[PDB]
Design a protein around this ligand. Structure first.
Ligand SMILES: [N]S(=O)(=O)[C][C][C][C+]123[B@]45[B@@]67[B@@]89[C@@]1%10B81%11B698B746B814B562B%10%1143
Ligand SMILES: [Zn+2]
Length: 257
């Protein structure tokens, strides 16, 4: 039932998912002057060389590229994390215009979109078990701004016409998620939640400081997706972002000075 519109959007979610009003909800505004540089934080280890992408899917809330997570093929380690986290999927949040779309904000700045690479902690064995744990997931968040094209995104863009509506999927093998990363792995980190239902408070967020640039043609193709299923009234898939939630008793740490 949930979505992003007036009658089923973020302000309604708490009725079915009461943790929406919890103590560690995401996203948040990252106040750059308040975030503390932590010299104990390690460099992030992103090991995606052996990634095996499987499918691309329109689930009526975003589109996702799914990966084989049955072995340590594409893993996140280091940074704020203990142990090893396997990549399961990535997806995006974006706006109707370039001045909104991101979930996290930086000194109240909204980016045009935000990429989430979702990983789960191998010590819990599968993602369904991991979402029940406070250290179950690690989501790597990357901002998108509009400028030059991102070559590593083009393969994704070019298949979106095949998954226009909710419930459509396609084969999406041999996609290298390394092509979606910025140069720097400088990051902010804090304890939070999923930003969609079920809003589980299971995520260590790692938000990269450096945005990637994508072209206007690339983001325009995101905005041609539909929230609806085929045969239902057409509703453009845009503004699929949750606003910033209260920071409450949390510290955002920076890996960089
Ligand atoms: N914006 S966000 O918090 O990254 C949405 C994650 C929803 C998910 B919940 B169920 B499916 C999709 B997979 B699996 B857990 B794992 B987690 B990922
Ligand atoms: Zn997300």
């Amino acid at each position: 039932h949930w979505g992003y519109g007036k009658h089923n959007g973020p302000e309604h979610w708490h009725k079915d998912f009461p943790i929406a009003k919890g103590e560690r909800q995401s996203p948040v505004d990252i106040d750059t002057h308040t975030a503390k540089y932590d010299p104990s934080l390690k460099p992030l280890s992103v090991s995606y060389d052996q990634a095996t992408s499987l499918r691309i899917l329109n689930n009526g809330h975003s589109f996702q590229v799914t990966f084989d997570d049955s072995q340590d093929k594409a893993v996140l380690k280091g940074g704020p994390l203990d142990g090893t986290y396997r990549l399961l999927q990535f997806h995006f949040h974006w706006g109707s215009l370039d001045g909104q779309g991101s979930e996290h904000t930086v000194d109240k700045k909204k980016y045009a979109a935000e990429l989430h690479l979702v990983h789960w902690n191998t010590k819990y064995g599968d993602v369904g078990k991991a979402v029940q744990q406070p250290d179950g997931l690690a989501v790597l968040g990357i901002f998108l701004k509009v400028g030059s094209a991102k070559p590593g995104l083009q393969k994704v863009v070019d298949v979106l016409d095949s998954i226009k509506t909710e419930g459509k999927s396609a084969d999406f093998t041999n996609f290298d998620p390394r092509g979606l990363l910025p140069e720097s792995l400088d990051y902010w980190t804090y304890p939070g939640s999923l930003t969609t239902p079920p809003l589980a408070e299971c995520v260590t967020w790692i938000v990269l400081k450096e945005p990637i640039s994508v072209s206007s043609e690339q983001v325009l193709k995101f905005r041609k997706l539909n929230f609806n299923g085929e045969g239902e009234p057409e509703e453009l898939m845009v503004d699929n972002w949750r606003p910033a939630q209260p920071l409450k008793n949390r510290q955002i740490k920076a890996s960089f000075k």
